[PDB]
């Protein structure tokens, strides 16, 4: 699976780039999946978790930090939660929350749709601050009723998208992205935020071809988008998905035409080199860097399971693209076109031929990969004869069926 | 005793409000200059300490359906009645005086306390003397004393308010004879009394015989008598005799306001007792002594400091480490911290800047997750509220901000933006040739001195010239990391730097810098026998404090 | 806004203080010489009569002394204090007069509270009294709630003295209703006859109407000359009248004669995957599978009992707390044989999981059931009172047992475990040691047939049968049930048609479950094939399903639509 042992993560930048519950979940993911660095990740997590009235997840994080500190007290041979925080946090949280509940119930008795919608959004934000997922949803799911303006609908969609990411109800995200896009007549770049929401939601839904297409349409003018995904990861997410799905012509057109992914490639020069090396047929340098970035994003919140399939697809596509211009390519040179061994490439090539889309034959005598260019006519005639034989067999079958049905032959 | 109120308390006062608004079960009606207020005797008894006697004494008032209550405002009684029917006051900022007057007349204790707490918290800039007379008219000792100290500072500050002219004799004697006058000179109180006495006629001349003797004798032998000769009624002989008697006696003693020594306020120092983390201390440039200050929250740290031209200290933001948007103000005499209106966003190390009487907080990790992370928020020292202003142009961290020529200037790694308060917009300024952060700037005269950064970079900027230039490098010992602090002192630019080496103790020394010499002359070296180590996250600011109110910090040399 | 809670109680306690300390009193209620100093405010806040007594403009509007008549001092005092402190202490005796004064004063809130209490208090011994009370005062909701409970409980008892003192209109509604639960149409006939003969000729005019609601299968046979004996002398307007009167009114059988012996099943496999489990039933005579109402709040891990009066009760169980999530609750429910719904009853003291519900002497006994306590007495055996609607603890069992079954024989509780057995003596509340089984088997069920205990199966289960005799106090083997080899039969012991039958579902290797029941010959010690349940009507039920013997009405229930 994942949970590997990799050094060199920059905790300060990754924590500061995100903000909110999005930051909290990522810090929890980093700590749980990266040992030998979990303590500082947990120490930084609990330092930020106590801010903005966390109740249930604080107990889980504090318990994990207490276990982590206890582990450090036995290897080179547990912090107090300061329960006064509970007394302080609960009394403060309740008082303002009831006062906010106080004010909104006045507006329910005053009957103003926008005021009711705005108050419930504040209640939803407060519940999210208080650490109440479903409670925030119901406030948002009853503020959706009292909408009056298109911007109010846009704000309603954004709030539901934000919550459903935490709830992992990505179906609700995609539905509200479609509602927020298709309805209002397809400087304020609002569609860019919606496209970013769809791209990450699709990627979390094990979708790659649409996620890359949506991510490539995201303009860099959005800049600060920390509640869902940092721009640095967006560029990484877009580049990996484009590499696995977009072909060479598809890659070149979309990257250049977007003119925002060029900026995204500037933030992440590593993935930019990958596509350029992918284009110029230097898959040896392309894949060695790929493993270097692998360990880094192997501890990414919504990438770790998906990227393993993405990287496997990248290796398959690179091999297909490499051998495509060659009718007879030496397997030694193809093996030398990566750090892989001769035997390992032969097994990988054999697997690719079994799956398909390489159309090649392996001459293991001299270890030379000869491309298969079978004439269309021979295969056409063979499969036409097979089709005729199958048609004759099915004709005999239906002939027998008609005979037995006309003669009323059946077991009583 | 079992006094459960879950879904049972509301039901009663739900009905009684419904019964009141529908005019049901009413047996007593209040006539208020022709306005009828049908209500109940029982609700009035539990709320007002006067209505209980209004309906219980064996007088004819008990057997009277219509009672004509006068000297009460209809609106104030109605808001009192509805508060006696729903428990909610919902008081405004204008009708507080009349509401308190009617509450005192009706002896409604709960609303009296609520109005007292509202009044004690809303003495901002102008109503101090007005409500002090209101507190003098109706005994509100807790508010009276709070207003007394508040008036003492503020009245001395303005000393031209028209509301001060009308006052009782006893209140003026308490104000004027007190030793809490925040005045650096003894003649400003003299002329304030003179203008107060010349405002009216003989009736005030009777009070002149008692108020003239509450000032130190240095101002009673002055031109006061010479100006009194033309202002005295004719055929007055004995009045002159008693005036001559007020020269020698009555214990001429120094005041307290003259002890406004210009000092340096420090925060987050190395605490002596290990049970405490940080502490706030002060240093006296002239007295060469180290004073201490009480921590405002006593548990929260990472605060920002600002000093208004009127020598006021404010604290905003910080983390307990949960971030709290609380606000506090330092008392110059009580050595305490009175909280104020909190901010709407929980900031980490905010940078507060004062300009045009408004406190501007620039940056400092607002919420971090803003759609526009580059925002600022200002404070109103008069209205006591926070007003949103134009957001920041660019994202900056560990930045500094100063005020020059009534304009807001914020400094970052290499960029600078000037905020125009009149139009509420940011304007592009000069770009610095060196990228340095983790440093602060000082607003001395018409020049901004950005000192330090990562060092000893001295980059001087002029508003009138709009250019950045180098002057020199501070003389510091090698193999060290100096902690530079630039601040104005005695109308002269000076620095406060500490050098730390390997296996060596920290040394504190301040230098005098000259504009045309580009050299930091040795002004004074702070001896370690009086000042100990401060730390790394300490901050420095300049302001006036009182040695008597504060206490010396005990520490072994 | 919601109005403030803190000021509400502070004013509320001042309402009470001004009442207990007689100060602001302007009106006093004069009731049978008892002084009631109070206020015009509080009295009419709850009462809708005092608002028309004070704010009406009559003589009392100024008069400060009112002589309230036809009321009770205790009822007025509790009503007055309830208006002042909000506490309504309702006992089991004064609720009758409480409703009388509540209706007289038209006080809406106490009327609802006492009505709800009477809805909870309706039972067998006061059904006639409450229905007449619900007829005296229009309380339609209670009247309909009573009438349904009245209809079933009259037919069972039909001997209460208050039945004689009933209005003619009420009796006509009761007798002509199609909700009566009677094994025969003759018991209602004689019940009407004794009611008519209870009094003098005042019942003669109602006799022309009461017979107009009864079927004609007894309006020509016996109990016509008996009335002629009881006829007033020389009355020639009745004997001839009834002679030519019983032509109309459409003979039709009633509904109470449709209680067939059926096997009630609980926690069956739900057909629709949206629900966890369901409840079904098998018809040994109709050969169909009728659906039943779901357990209350999908109450799983429960126990069933059927009293000799043919009543179904549910105790114990757990509800999924709001992935594994389940919390145990001690809620109790009663099943309505006609409305196809579960009426809630008084909950137990401790929560139970799979409790053994056994009825004896009218008391429902729940033995064990994985209680929450777990103390030294980790059994928590407790009986239920069907008379007072309450639970009373009984003598604890000598030993701690798990996955046990209990039956009732000879007015005694016989609970069985892996190898031990103890008999509970309800008259002295003591336990006595019984015979010891020679085989260690658990997860089985036992059925009480006559004076013998038949422990069928045990451990899947097997075909081992150990027969115990109460009079002999010994465990003996009889035979083994002939079943297909390499299978896991699910045995279910039950008594039906005055015989010991077994509901055994067997599953072969890689085969679907097959349903078949056998009749065990008591004298021949052999299981005979009584009937084979075809799979076209009965589908899979599961493993944790329970079976019990009882009677249900096919008319009120509906056939379950499901593919064979």
Curated annotation (Swiss-Prot), chain A:
Q: Which SUPFAM superfamilies does the entry link to? A: Winged helix' DNA-binding domain
Q: Which Gene3D superfamilies match?
A: 1.25.40.570
Q: What is its main location?
A: cytoplasm
**According to its record, what are the GO cellular component terms?**
COP9 signalosome; cytoplasm; cytosol; nucleoplasm; nucleus
A Gene Ontology biological process term: protein deneddylation
Per UniProt, the keywords (alphabetical) are: Cytoplasm, Nucleus, Phosphoprotein, Signalosome
Q: Which domain of life is it from?
A: Eukaryota
Pfam families to which the protein is assigned, alphabetical: CSN1_C, PCI, RPN7
Q: Which GO terms describe its molecular function?
A: GTPase inhibitor activity
On tissue specificity, the annotation reads:
Widely expressed.
Query: What residue stretches are annotated with the PCI domain?
Result: 214-376
Query: Where does this polypeptide localize?
Result: Cytoplasm; Nucleus
Describe the subunit structure.
Component of the CSN complex, composed of COPS1/GPS1, COPS2, COPS3, COPS4, COPS5, COPS6, COPS7 (COPS7A or COPS7B), COPS8 and COPS9 isoform 1. In the complex, it probably interacts directly with COPS2, COPS3, COPS4 and COPS5. Interacts directly with inositol kinase ITPK1. Interacts with CAPN8. Interacts with USP48. Interacts with ASB4; this interaction negatively regulates GPS1.
Biological role stated in the UniProt entry: Essential component of the COP9 signalosome complex (CSN), a complex involved in various cellular and developmental processes. The CSN complex is an essential regulator of the ubiquitin (Ubl) conjugation pathway by mediating the deneddylation of the cullin subunits of SCF-type E3 ligase complexes, leading to decrease the Ubl ligase activity of SCF-type complexes such as SCF, CSA or DDB2. The complex is also involved in phosphorylation of p53/TP53, c-jun/JUN, IkappaBalpha/NFKBIA, ITPK1 and IRF8/ICSBP, possibly via its association with CK2 and PKD kinases.
Fill in the domain comment: The PCI domain is necessary and sufficient for the interactions with other CSN subunits of the complex. Mediates the interaction with CAPN8. The N-terminal part (1-216), which is not required for deneddylating activity and CSN complex formation, is nevertheless essential for other aspects of CSN complex function, such as repression of c-fos/FOS expression.
State the similarity comment.
Answer: Belongs to the CSN1 family.
Protein name (Swiss-Prot/TrEMBL): COP9 signalosome complex subunit 1
Swiss-Prot record, chain B:
Sorted alphabetically, the Gene Ontology cellular component annotations on this record are: Cul3-RING ubiquitin ligase complex; cytoplasm
Q: What are the residue boundaries of the BTB domain, all occurrences included? A: 26-93
Q: Which Gene3D superfamilies match?
A: 1.25.40.420, Kelch-type beta propeller, Potassium Channel Kv1.1, Chain A
Q: List the GO molecular function terms.
A: ubiquitin-like ligase-substrate adaptor activity
Spans of repeat Kelch: 312-357, 358-406, 408-446, 447-488, 494-540
Q: In which pathway does it act?
A: Protein modification; protein ubiquitination
User: What biological-process GO terms show up in the record?
Assistant: gene expression; glucose metabolic process; lipid metabolic process; phosphatidylinositol 3-kinase/protein kinase B signal transduction; proteasome-mediated ubiquitin-dependent protein catabolic process; protein K48-linked ubiquitination; regulation of cellular response to insulin stimulus; response to insulin
Residue ranges of every copy of the BACK domain listed in the record: 128-224
Write down the superkingdom of origin. Eukaryota
SUPFAM superfamilies membership:
Kelch motif, POZ domain
Which keywords, in A-to-Z order, does the entry hold?
Answer: Kelch repeat, Phosphoprotein, Repeat, Ubl conjugation pathway
Write out the function statement from the record: Substrate-specific adapter of a BCR (BTB-CUL3-RBX1) E3 ubiquitin ligase complex that acts as a regulator of the insulin signaling pathway, modulating insulin sensitivity by limiting PIK3R1/p85alpha abundance in adipocytes. Targets PIK3R1, the regulatory subunit of phosphatidylinositol 3-kinase (PI3K), for 'Lys-48'-linked polyubiquitination and proteasome-mediated degradation.
What does the subunit comment say? Component of the BCR(KBTBD2) E3 ubiquitin ligase complex, at least composed of CUL3, KBTBD2 and RBX1. Interacts (via the BTB domain) with CUL3.
Q: What is known of its domains?
A: Recognizes the BCR (BTB-CUL3-RBX1) E3 ubiquitin ligase complex substrate, PIK3R1, through the 4 tandem C-terminal Kelch domains.
- Protein name, as recorded: Kelch repeat and BTB domain-containing protein 2
Tell me which species this is from: Homo sapiens
């Amino acid at each position: 699976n994942y949970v590997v042992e990799n050094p060199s993560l920059d905790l300060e930048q990754y924590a500061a780039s995100y903000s909110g519950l999005m930051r909290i979940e990522r810090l929890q993911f980093i700590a749980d999946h990266c040992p030998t660095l979990r303590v500082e990740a947990l120490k930084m997590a609990l330092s930020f978790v106590q801010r903005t009235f966390n109740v249930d997840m604080y107990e889980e994080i504090h318990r994990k930090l207490s276990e982590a500190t206890r582990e450090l007290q036995n290897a080179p041979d547990p912090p107090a939660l300061d329960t006064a925080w509970v007394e302080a946090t609960r009394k403060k949280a309740l008082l303002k929350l009831e006062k906010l509940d106080t004010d909104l119930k006045n507006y329910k008795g005053n009957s103003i749709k926008e005021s009711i919608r705005r108050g419930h959004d504040d209640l939803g934000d407060h519940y999210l601050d208080c650490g109440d997922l479903s409670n925030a949803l119901k406030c948002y799911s009853r503020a959706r009723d009292y909408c009056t303006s298109a911007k109010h609908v846009i704000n309603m969609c954004l709030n539901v998208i934000k919550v459903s990411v935490y709830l992992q109800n990505w179906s609700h995200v995609l539905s509200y992205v479609s509602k927020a896009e298709s309805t209002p007549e397809i400087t304020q770049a609002i569609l860019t935020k919606l496209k970013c929401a769809a791209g990450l939601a699709e990627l979390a839904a094990r979708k790659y071809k649409q996620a890359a297409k949506c991510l490539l349409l995201a303009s860099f003018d959005h800049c600060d988008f920390p509640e869902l995904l940092s721009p640095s990861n967006v560029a990484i997410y877009g580049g990996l998905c484009a590499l696995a799905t977009f072909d060479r012509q598809e890659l070149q057109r979309n990257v250049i035409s977007s003119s925002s992914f060029k900026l995204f490639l500037e933030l992440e020069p590593q993935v930019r080199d990958i596509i350029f090396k992918f284009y110029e047929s230097k898959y040896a340098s392309c894949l060695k860097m790929l493993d270097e970035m692998k360990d880094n994003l192997l501890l990414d919140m919504y990438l770790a399971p998906h990227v393993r399939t993405l990287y496997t697809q990248i290796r398959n596509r690179a091999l297909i693209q490499y051998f495509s211009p060659y009718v007879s390519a030496d397997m030694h040179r193809m093996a030398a076109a990566f750090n892989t061994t001769v035997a390992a490439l032969e097994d990988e090539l054999t697997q690719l031929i079994l799956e398909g889309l390489i159309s090649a034959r392996v001459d293991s005598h001299s270890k030379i990969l000869y491309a298969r260019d079978v004439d269309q006519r021979s295969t056409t005639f063979e499969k036409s004869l097979l089709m005729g034989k199958e048609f004759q067999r099915r004709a005999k079958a239906m002939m027998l069926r008609a005979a037995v049905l006309r003669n009323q032959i059946h077991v009583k | 005793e079992r006094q459960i109120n879950t879904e049972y308390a509301v039901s009663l006062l739900e009905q009684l409000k419904l019964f009141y608004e529908q005019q049901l079960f009413t047996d007593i009606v209040l006539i208020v200059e022709g306005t009828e207020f049908p209500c109940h005797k029982m609700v009035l008894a539990t709320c007002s300490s006067y209505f209980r006697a209004m309906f219980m004494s064996g007088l004819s008032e008990s057997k009277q359906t219509h009672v004509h209550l006068r000297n009460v405002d209809a609106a104030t009684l109605q808001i009192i009645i509805t508060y006696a029917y729903t428990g909610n006051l919902a008081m405004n900022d204008s009708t507080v005086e009349q509401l308190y007057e009617t509450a005192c007349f009706l002896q409604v204790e709960d609303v009296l306390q609520r109005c007292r707490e509202y009044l004690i918290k809303k003495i901002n800039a102008e109503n101090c003397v007005r409500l002090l007379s209101f507190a003098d008219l109706f005994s509100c000792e807790e508010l009276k004393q709070s207003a007394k100290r508040m008036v003492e500072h503020k009245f001395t500050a303005v000393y031209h308010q028209d509301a001060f002219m009308q006052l009782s004799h006893d209140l003026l004697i308490d104000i004027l004879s007190s030793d809490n006058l925040n005045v650096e000179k003894e003649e400003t109180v003299r002329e304030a009394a003179m203008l107060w006495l010349e405002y009216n006629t003989e009736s005030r001349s009777q009070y002149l015989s008692s108020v003239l003797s509450q000032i130190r004798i240095d101002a009673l032998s002055e031109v006061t008598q010479r100006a009194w000769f033309q202002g005295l009624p004719p055929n007055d002989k004995s009045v002159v005799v008693q005036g001559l008697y007020k020269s020698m006696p009555k214990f001429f003693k120094p005041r307290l306001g003259m002890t406004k020594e210009e000092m340096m306020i420090f925060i987050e120092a190395s605490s002596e007792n290990p049970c405490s983390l940080y502490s706030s201390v002060c240093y006296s440039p002239q007295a060469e002594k180290v004073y201490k200050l009480c921590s405002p929250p006593a548990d929260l740290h990472k605060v920002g400091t600002v000093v208004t031209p009127d020598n006021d200290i404010y604290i905003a933001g910080g983390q307990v480490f949960r971030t709290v948007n609380c606000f506090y103000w330092f008392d110059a005499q009580q050595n305490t911290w009175f909280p104020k209106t909190p901010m709407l966003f929980v900031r980490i190390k905010p940078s507060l800047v004062c300009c045009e009487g408004y406190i501007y907080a620039i940056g400092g990790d607002s919420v971090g997750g803003e759609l526009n992370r580059r925002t600022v928020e200002r404070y109103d020292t008069e209205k006591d509220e926070w007003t949103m202003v134009s957001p920041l142009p660019c994202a900056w961290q560990w930045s500094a901000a100063v005020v020059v020529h009534d304009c807001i200037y914020v400094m970052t790694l290499n960029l600078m933006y000037c905020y125009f308060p009149r139009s509420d917009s940011w304007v592009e300024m000069a770009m610095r040739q060196t990228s340095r952060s983790f440093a602060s700037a000082a607003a001395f005269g018409d020049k901004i001195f950005y000192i330090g950064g990562l060092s000893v970079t001295v980059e001087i900027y002029d508003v009138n010239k709009n250019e950045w230039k180098m002057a020199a490098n501070i003389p510091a010992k090698r193999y060290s990391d100096p902690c530079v602090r630039a601040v104005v002192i005695s109308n002269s630019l000076c620095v406060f730097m500490r050098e730390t080496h390997l296996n060596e103790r920290a040394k504190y020394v301040t230098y005098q810098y000259d504009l045309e010499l580009d050299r930091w002359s040795l002004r004074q070296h702070i001896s370690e026998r009086v000042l100990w180590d401060l730390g790394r996250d300490f901050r420095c600011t300049v302001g006036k404090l009182y040695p008597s109110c504060l206490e010396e910090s005990p520490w072994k040399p």
